[PDB]
Amino acid sequence: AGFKGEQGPKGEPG
Amino acid sequence: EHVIIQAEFYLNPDQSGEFMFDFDGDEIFHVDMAKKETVWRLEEFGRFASFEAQGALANIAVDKANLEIMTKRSNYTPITNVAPEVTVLSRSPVNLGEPNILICFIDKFSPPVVNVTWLRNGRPVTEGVSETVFLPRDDHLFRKFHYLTFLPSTDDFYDCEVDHWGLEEPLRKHWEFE
Amino acid sequence: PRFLWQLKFECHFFNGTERVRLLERCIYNQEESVRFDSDVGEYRAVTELGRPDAEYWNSQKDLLEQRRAAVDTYCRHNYGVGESFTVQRRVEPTVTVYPTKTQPLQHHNLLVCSVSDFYPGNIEVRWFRNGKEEETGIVSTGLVRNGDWTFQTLVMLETVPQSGEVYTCQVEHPSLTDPVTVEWKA
Numbered sequence: 001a002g003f004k005g006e007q008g009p010k011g012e013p014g
Numbered sequence: 015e016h017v018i019i020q021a022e023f024y025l026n027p028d029q030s031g032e033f034m035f036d037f038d039g040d041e042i043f044h045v046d047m048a049k050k051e052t053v054w055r056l057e058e059f060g061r062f063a064s065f066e067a068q069g070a071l072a073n074i075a076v077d078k079a080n081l082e083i084m085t086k087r088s089n090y091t092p093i094t095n096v097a098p099e100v101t102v103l104s105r106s107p108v109n110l111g112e113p114n115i116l117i118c119f120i121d122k123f124s125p126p127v128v129n130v131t132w133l134r135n136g137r138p139v140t141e142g143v144s145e146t147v148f149l150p151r152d153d154h155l156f157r158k159f160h161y162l163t164f165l166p167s168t169d170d171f172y173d174c175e176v177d178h179w180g181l182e183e184p185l186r187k188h189w190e191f192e
Numbered sequence: 193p194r195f196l197w198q199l200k201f202e203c204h205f206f207n208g209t210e211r212v213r214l215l216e217r218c219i220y221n222q223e224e225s226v227r228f229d230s231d232v233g234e235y236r237a238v239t240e241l242g243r244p245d246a247e248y249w250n251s252q253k254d255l256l257e258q259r260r261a262a263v264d265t266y267c268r269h270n271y272g273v274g275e276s277f278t279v280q281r282r283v284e285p286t287v288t289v290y291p292t293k294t295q296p297l298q299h300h301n302l303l304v305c306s307v308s309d310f311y312p313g314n315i316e317v318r319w320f321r322n323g324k325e326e327e328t329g330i331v332s333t334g335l336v337r338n339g340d341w342t343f344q345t346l347v348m349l350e351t352v353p354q355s356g357e358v359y360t361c362q363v364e365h366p367s368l369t370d371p372v373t374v375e376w377k378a
Contacts, residue, residue: 002063002273003035006020006201006216006266008073009255011080012248014087016279018270020201025194037278038312040341056341062277073199081197084220084241093194093221105338107288107306117338124222125194146339154198154222159339 018042021150022070024077025093025125026085031078032126032147033070044147045070055146096155097180098123102189108166116189118174120158122151125179132162133173166191196221203267212271214263218245230263282367283342285310287374289361291353297378300352305361305374308344312366313337317347320360353378 019036034044043054045067052067054060098120105115120128126148132139142163149157160174171190178185198219205212217227217238225242226249228235234256237246249255258265271279285307293301307317313335319326326349333346349359360375 003065003270004266005033005065005069005073006262007069008076008199008201008216008218009245009249009252010076011083011218012244014083014244016205016271018203018267018274018278021198022200023196023198025196028194037274039337040339042274042278059277063274077197077199080199080218081195084197084225085195087244088220088241090195091221093196096222103336103344105340105342105344106286106308107290119339125196127194149339150198150200154219154224 019150022073022077023126023148023150024074024081025127026078026081028125028127029078030127031074033074034147034150035065036150041146041149047071047074093125095178095180096122096124098128098158098176098178098185100174100176100185100187102172102174102187105161108191110166110168110191113163113165116162116164116172116174118160118162118176118187120160120176120178122153122155122157123178123180124155126156127179128158129177129184130158130160131175132160133175134162134164135169135171136173198222201266203271205267205271209268209271212263212267214259214267216259216262218242228259230260233260235259281311281341283309283311284367285315285363285365285372287361287363287372289359289374289376291376292348297355298352300350303349303351303359303376305347305349305363306344307347307361307363307365308342310343310365310367311341313343314366315343315345316364317345318362318364319347319349320362321351322358 016038022033024031035042041055046053052065099122101119103117108114144161146159151157174187176185202215214230224238226245235246235249237243286309288306331348336344355378358375358377362371362373364371
């Protein structure tokens with residue numbers, strides 16, 4: 001009954 | 015004045031991925047990739063908490079790519095190895111015949127890849143030993159712990175042998191009763 | 193030839209959970225490239241490499257709006273989930289004292305006060321000789337992080353144990369309602 005993970009964005013291809 | 019940190023790192027070529035939670039310095043848990051599950055630093059935490067591991071795997075994936083992306087417009091600037099400072103201490107004060115635990119602090123290094131070994135009277139120890147994944151540090155380097163369980167004796171003596179690219183020859187710290 | 197990409201989602205708390213700062217930072221080898229500081233409300237570039245992401249992301253409104261709110265949906269969220277076993281974890285310190293050197297009365301040696309197995313890290317240690325507190329020449333190893341949610345320290349004191357003396361290490365720690373004392377004599 002707990003903890004969330006903070007999702008993350010994806011890098012700009014280069 | 016507490017802090018919680020979702021520290022995650024990915025590195026090539028090794029392809030070692032890590033996702034973990036840190037609180038005021040110590041790790042709450044990390045996600046075992048292989049087992050695709052969650053590993054609590056203290057079994058008690060589990061009865062207290064929960065974490066959907068599948069979601070960790072995602073981030074690492076984006077991370078793996080985000081790396082490949084950066085690894086490129088950096089002109090393949092490789093990682094500059096940082097030598098690990100190594101030291102040894104007992105968890106509690108030592109008394110003969112009183113089981114105790116030897117700690118080996120591998121601190122302030124990078125990359126998060128290393129080789130550790132416990133030695134009892136010259137010989138490598140295999141039973142009664144544990145460790146921790148690569149812990150993050152405010153300076154962006156890594157921290158690692160290792161544990162040996164022993165029963166203080168006068169003849170016995172130990173060594174925590176640590177190897178890491180940032181050294182010429184493996185590092186060998188000693189320890190013995192008093 | 194290794195390549196490392198780090199990533200850190202940190203939540204900073206001040207005064208319980210009244211003021212909180214979310215800091216989402218993506219790091220390269222050991223060089224932080226971009227970051228989102230709740231105290232600004234948008235990604236910023238820290239070096240040259242990050243500028244790209246600083247733009248591509250600051251353009252994604254569903255992203256920014258989610259990030260800006262992360263201060264509660266994330267920070268204030270986990271803080272309250274793990275408070276009981278993290279923020280309020282308490283472990284009493286077991287104290288041990290012992291003479292460093294081996295020398296009959298009248299000869300000058302270290303006295304070590306081991307304060308181990310404790311949490312939080314916040315702690316105070318004091319040296320006493322026959323009721324009079326010591327302040328000068330007190331060397332401290334500093335605080336140690338054992339890695340298993342436990343701290344430890346060593347506070348040394350040098351003297352010339354004379355017969356009848358009583359050295360006492362007094363410790364005060366949040367896990368204690370009353371200080372723990374350990375004496376030692378000649």
